Amino acid sequence: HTRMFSVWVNGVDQGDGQNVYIRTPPNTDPIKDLASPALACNVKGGEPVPQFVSASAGDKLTFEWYRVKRGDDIIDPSHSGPITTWIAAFTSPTMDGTGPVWSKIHEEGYDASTKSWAVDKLIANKGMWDFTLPSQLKPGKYMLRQEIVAHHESDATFDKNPKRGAQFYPSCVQVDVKGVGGDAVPDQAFDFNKGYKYSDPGIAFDMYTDFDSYPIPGPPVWDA
Ligand SMILES: [Cu+2]
Protein backbone atom coordinates (compact mmCIF):
# COMPACT_ATOMS: atom_id res chain seq x y z
CA HIS A 1 0.00 0.00 0.00
CA THR A 2 1.47 3.26 -1.23
CA ARG A 3 0.72 6.29 -3.48
CA MET A 4 2.33 9.51 -4.67
CA PHE A 5 2.54 12.84 -2.81
CA SER A 6 4.40 15.08 -5.24
CA VAL A 7 6.83 15.44 -8.11
CA TRP A 8 10.21 17.23 -7.95
CA VAL A 9 11.93 18.73 -11.02
CA ASN A 10 15.74 18.87 -10.78
CA GLY A 11 15.43 18.67 -6.98
CA VAL A 12 12.73 21.33 -6.68
CA ASP A 13 9.53 20.11 -5.03
CA GLN A 14 6.54 21.13 -7.17
CA GLY A 15 4.35 20.77 -4.04
CA ASP A 16 1.48 18.39 -3.12
CA GLY A 17 0.30 17.10 -6.46
CA GLN A 18 -2.58 14.95 -5.30
CA ASN A 19 -5.60 15.67 -7.58
CA VAL A 20 -3.61 18.67 -8.90
CA TYR A 21 -1.15 17.12 -11.35
CA ILE A 22 -1.32 13.48 -10.11
CA ARG A 23 -4.38 11.35 -10.94
CA THR A 24 -4.53 10.27 -7.34
CA PRO A 25 -6.55 7.13 -6.51
CA PRO A 26 -8.99 7.32 -3.58
CA ASN A 27 -6.71 5.08 -1.52
CA THR A 28 -3.52 3.00 -1.52
CA ASP A 29 -5.18 -0.33 -2.57
CA PRO A 30 -3.36 -2.30 -5.25
CA ILE A 31 -4.63 -3.31 -8.66
CA LYS A 32 -4.45 -7.11 -9.08
CA ASP A 33 -6.76 -7.89 -11.96
CA LEU A 34 -4.75 -7.70 -15.20
CA ALA A 35 -7.96 -7.09 -17.20
CA SER A 36 -8.89 -4.06 -15.10
CA PRO A 37 -8.94 -0.72 -17.05
CA ALA A 38 -7.44 0.72 -13.80
CA LEU A 39 -4.17 -1.14 -14.39
CA ALA A 40 -2.64 1.71 -16.43
CA CYS A 41 -3.55 4.77 -14.31
CA ASN A 42 -5.35 3.35 -11.27
CA VAL A 43 -8.94 3.84 -10.36
CA LYS A 44 -9.27 7.54 -11.07
CA GLY A 45 -6.97 7.12 -14.08
CA GLY A 46 -9.52 8.53 -16.54
CA GLU A 47 -10.37 11.67 -14.47
CA PRO A 48 -8.43 14.76 -15.48
CA VAL A 49 -6.73 16.99 -12.95
CA PRO A 50 -6.15 20.66 -13.66
CA GLN A 51 -2.35 21.05 -13.71
CA PHE A 52 0.70 19.71 -15.52
CA VAL A 53 4.12 19.42 -14.02
CA SER A 54 6.35 21.80 -15.90
CA ALA A 55 9.60 20.18 -17.06
CA SER A 56 12.14 19.97 -19.86
CA ALA A 57 13.43 17.02 -21.82
CA GLY A 58 16.52 15.81 -19.96
CA ASP A 59 15.32 16.98 -16.52
CA LYS A 60 15.71 14.72 -13.49
CA LEU A 61 12.28 13.98 -12.03
CA THR A 62 11.63 12.68 -8.59
CA PHE A 63 8.34 10.99 -7.79
CA GLU A 64 7.71 10.97 -4.08
CA TRP A 65 5.59 8.21 -2.52
CA TYR A 66 4.06 7.70 0.93
CA ARG A 67 1.92 5.23 2.80
CA VAL A 68 -0.39 7.22 5.12
CA LYS A 69 1.52 10.43 5.83
CA ARG A 70 4.18 12.21 3.83
CA GLY A 71 7.70 11.06 4.80
CA ASP A 72 6.57 7.94 6.76
CA ASP A 73 7.62 4.28 6.15
CA ILE A 74 6.42 4.62 2.49
CA ILE A 75 5.41 1.01 1.92
CA ASP A 76 5.43 -2.21 4.02
CA PRO A 77 8.96 -3.62 3.63
CA SER A 78 7.45 -7.06 2.81
CA HIS A 79 6.24 -5.55 -0.53
CA SER A 80 9.47 -6.37 -2.41
CA GLY A 81 9.52 -5.71 -6.13
CA PRO A 82 10.44 -3.58 -9.08
CA ILE A 83 9.69 0.01 -9.88
CA THR A 84 9.09 1.04 -13.50
CA THR A 85 8.46 4.35 -15.16
CA TRP A 86 6.63 4.85 -18.47
CA ILE A 87 5.48 7.62 -20.82
CA ALA A 88 2.47 8.10 -23.13
CA ALA A 89 1.27 10.97 -25.27
CA PHE A 90 -1.43 13.07 -23.58
CA THR A 91 -4.20 12.43 -26.19
CA SER A 92 -7.02 14.03 -24.25
CA PRO A 93 -7.88 14.81 -20.64
CA THR A 94 -10.29 11.87 -20.51
CA MET A 95 -7.63 9.43 -21.57
CA ASP A 96 -7.22 6.62 -19.02
CA GLY A 97 -3.99 5.01 -20.14
CA THR A 98 -5.65 2.05 -21.80
CA GLY A 99 -4.58 0.99 -25.25
CA PRO A 100 -1.24 0.55 -27.03
CA VAL A 101 0.27 3.82 -25.89
CA TRP A 102 3.14 3.33 -23.43
CA SER A 103 6.92 3.35 -23.56
CA LYS A 104 9.17 2.34 -20.68
CA ILE A 105 11.76 4.95 -19.81
CA HIS A 106 13.23 3.60 -16.57
CA GLU A 107 13.26 0.44 -14.47
CA GLU A 108 14.87 -1.12 -11.42
CA GLY A 109 14.20 -4.64 -10.18
CA TYR A 110 16.25 -7.08 -8.08
CA ASP A 111 19.91 -6.48 -7.26
CA ALA A 112 21.57 -9.87 -6.62
CA SER A 113 24.77 -8.30 -5.32
CA THR A 114 22.97 -6.81 -2.30
CA LYS A 115 19.95 -9.19 -2.21
CA SER A 116 17.66 -6.15 -2.37
CA TRP A 117 14.95 -4.63 -4.52
CA ALA A 118 13.88 -1.31 -6.01
CA VAL A 119 11.34 -1.15 -3.18
CA ASP A 120 14.08 -1.34 -0.48
CA LYS A 121 15.89 1.51 -2.19
CA LEU A 122 12.61 3.54 -2.31
CA ILE A 123 12.21 3.03 1.48
CA ALA A 124 15.86 3.96 2.10
CA ASN A 125 15.38 7.08 0.00
CA LYS A 126 12.32 8.09 2.07
CA GLY A 127 9.95 7.63 -0.82
CA MET A 128 11.94 9.58 -3.40
CA TRP A 129 12.28 7.80 -6.73
CA ASP A 130 14.47 9.48 -9.41
CA PHE A 131 14.55 9.08 -13.16
CA THR A 132 15.42 11.17 -16.17
CA LEU A 133 13.05 12.46 -18.81
CA PRO A 134 14.80 11.43 -22.05
CA SER A 135 16.62 14.48 -23.52
CA GLN A 136 15.58 13.55 -27.08
CA LEU A 137 11.88 13.76 -26.14
CA LYS A 138 9.66 15.79 -28.44
CA PRO A 139 8.03 18.67 -26.57
CA GLY A 140 4.33 18.34 -25.77
CA LYS A 141 2.04 17.06 -23.05
CA TYR A 142 2.54 13.52 -21.74
CA MET A 143 1.32 11.15 -19.12
CA LEU A 144 4.07 9.73 -16.96
CA ARG A 145 3.37 6.44 -15.22
CA GLN A 146 5.29 5.03 -12.32
CA GLU A 147 4.53 1.64 -10.90
CA ILE A 148 5.62 -0.32 -7.86
CA VAL A 149 4.88 -4.03 -8.08
CA ALA A 150 4.79 -5.93 -4.73
CA HIS A 151 5.59 -9.65 -4.94
CA HIS A 152 4.94 -10.86 -1.37
CA GLU A 153 1.92 -12.84 -2.70
CA SER A 154 3.02 -13.35 -6.31
CA ASP A 155 3.73 -17.04 -5.73
CA ALA A 156 0.12 -17.48 -6.87
CA THR A 157 -1.64 -15.64 -9.74
CA PHE A 158 -4.82 -13.62 -9.27
CA ASP A 159 -6.71 -15.55 -11.97
CA LYS A 160 -6.35 -18.80 -9.96
CA ASN A 161 -6.32 -17.32 -6.46
CA PRO A 162 -7.83 -13.85 -6.16
CA LYS A 163 -6.74 -13.70 -2.50
CA ARG A 164 -3.12 -13.56 -3.70
CA GLY A 165 -1.28 -12.36 -6.80
CA ALA A 166 1.10 -9.58 -7.68
CA GLN A 167 0.04 -6.13 -6.47
CA PHE A 168 0.36 -3.22 -8.85
CA TYR A 169 0.54 0.41 -7.56
CA PRO A 170 0.39 2.62 -10.69
CA SER A 171 0.48 6.40 -10.47
CA CYS A 172 -0.12 8.67 -13.48
CA VAL A 173 1.24 12.19 -13.59
CA GLN A 174 0.40 14.91 -16.14
CA VAL A 175 3.54 16.56 -17.52
CA ASP A 176 4.06 19.40 -19.94
CA VAL A 177 7.44 18.93 -21.55
CA LYS A 178 9.56 21.77 -23.02
CA GLY A 179 12.05 20.43 -25.61
CA VAL A 180 15.81 20.94 -25.66
CA GLY A 181 15.38 20.14 -29.13
CA GLY A 182 14.70 16.48 -29.67
CA ASP A 183 11.97 15.04 -31.87
CA ALA A 184 11.69 11.50 -30.51
CA VAL A 185 8.11 10.33 -30.01
CA PRO A 186 7.61 7.35 -27.66
CA ASP A 187 6.74 4.47 -29.96
CA GLN A 188 6.79 1.13 -28.09
CA ALA A 189 2.94 1.32 -27.98
CA PHE A 190 2.79 -1.07 -24.99
CA ASP A 191 -0.71 -1.96 -23.73
CA PHE A 192 -0.89 -3.08 -20.08
CA ASN A 193 -4.09 -5.11 -20.32
CA LYS A 194 -2.67 -6.99 -23.34
CA GLY A 195 1.04 -7.00 -22.38
CA TYR A 196 0.90 -7.98 -18.68
CA LYS A 197 -0.03 -11.68 -18.47
CA TYR A 198 -0.43 -14.20 -15.63
CA SER A 199 2.08 -16.39 -17.48
CA ASP A 200 4.77 -13.69 -17.23
CA PRO A 201 7.61 -15.01 -14.97
CA GLY A 202 7.88 -11.45 -13.64
CA ILE A 203 4.23 -11.59 -12.48
CA ALA A 204 3.96 -15.28 -11.53
CA PHE A 205 7.01 -14.89 -9.40
CA ASP A 206 7.92 -16.87 -6.29
CA MET A 207 10.12 -14.76 -4.08
CA TYR A 208 10.33 -17.49 -1.41
CA THR A 209 12.92 -19.61 -3.26
CA ASP A 210 16.60 -19.13 -4.05
CA PHE A 211 16.45 -17.04 -7.27
CA ASP A 212 19.38 -15.06 -8.65
CA SER A 213 17.39 -12.70 -10.89
CA TYR A 214 14.02 -11.15 -11.56
CA PRO A 215 12.65 -10.52 -15.10
CA ILE A 216 11.01 -7.09 -15.17
CA PRO A 217 7.80 -7.29 -17.25
CA GLY A 218 7.32 -5.40 -20.46
CA PRO A 219 9.66 -4.17 -23.18
CA PRO A 220 13.17 -2.93 -22.50
CA VAL A 221 13.78 0.73 -21.82
CA TRP A 222 12.89 2.85 -24.88
CA ASP A 223 15.75 3.97 -27.22
CA ALA A 224 15.32 7.05 -29.65
CU1 LIG B 1 0.20 -3.11 0.35
Residue numbers in the entry: 1 to 224
Give the authors' words.
LPMOs are reducing agent- and O2-dependent copper metalloenzymes now classified as auxiliary activity families AA9–AA11 and AA137–11. Extensive spectroscopic and structural studies on LPMOs have shown that the enzyme’s active site contains a single copper ion, which is coordinated by the amino terminus nitrogen atom, by a side chain nitrogen atom of the N-terminal histidine, and by the side chain nitrogen atom of an additional histidine, in a structural motif known as the histidine brace. What is distinctive about LPMOs is that they oxidatively rather than hydrolytically cleave polysaccharides producing saccharides with oxidized ends. We report herein a study into the principal structural and electronic factors of the reactivity of two AA9 LPMOs with a range of substrates.
